[PDB]
């Protein structure tokens, strides 16, 4: 009735980023702003993959 | 197979026969058949991707 379990979940692929970006919506949240726009990479002393390759 | 690939194209690899369920051989050793393609080919796929 009203109080009931699920037994099937919702399937993704039909909203906001799923097929055509909801047909290119001009709606965007505060959490979707540019933030941390630069990937850090491992340096020579950190564990760069060149340093990790020769090691036994 | 044509009644299995109705809405698919001609490049799609579907499996529809008994001879897809048969186990292959032990494939003795470091064979050039089961090898990851090439390092530069992998880098080219990476660049395109």
């Amino acid at each position: 009735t009203a109080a009931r379990p699920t037994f099937e979940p919702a399937r993704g692929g039909r909203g906001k980023g799923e097929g055509d970006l909801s047909q290119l919506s001009k709606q965007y949240s505060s959490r979707d702003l540019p933030s941390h726009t630069k990937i850090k990479y491992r340096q020579t002393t950190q564990d760069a993959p060149e340093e990790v390759r020769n090691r036994d | 197979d044509a009644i299995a690939r109705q809405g698919q194209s001609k490049d799609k690899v579907i499996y529809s026969k008994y001879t897809d369920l048969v186990p292959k051989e032990v494939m003795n050793a470091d064979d050039p058949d089961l090898q990851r393609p090439d390092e530069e080919a992998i880098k080219e796929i990476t660049e395109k991707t």
Binding site: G13, R14, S22, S25 | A4, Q6, I14, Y15
Partner: protein, 49 residues
């Protein structure tokens, strides 16, 4: 021969059309053959247990 210029967009113009319209999920791509084994025979005893 055709010269294509792209129409110049108004900066001050809101989105034009309703996008929130919602329709049910279409059919999935044609079913793949299931390729199982012959199937283990089931007993009355284990079916009841």
């Amino acid at each position: 021969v055709i010269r294509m210029v792209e129409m110049q967009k108004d900066p001050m113009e809101p989105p034009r059309f309703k996008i929130n319209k919602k329709i049910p999920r279409g059919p999935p791509s044609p079913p793949a053959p299931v390729m199982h084994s012959p199937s283990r025979k089931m007993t009355v005893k284990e079916q009841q247990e």
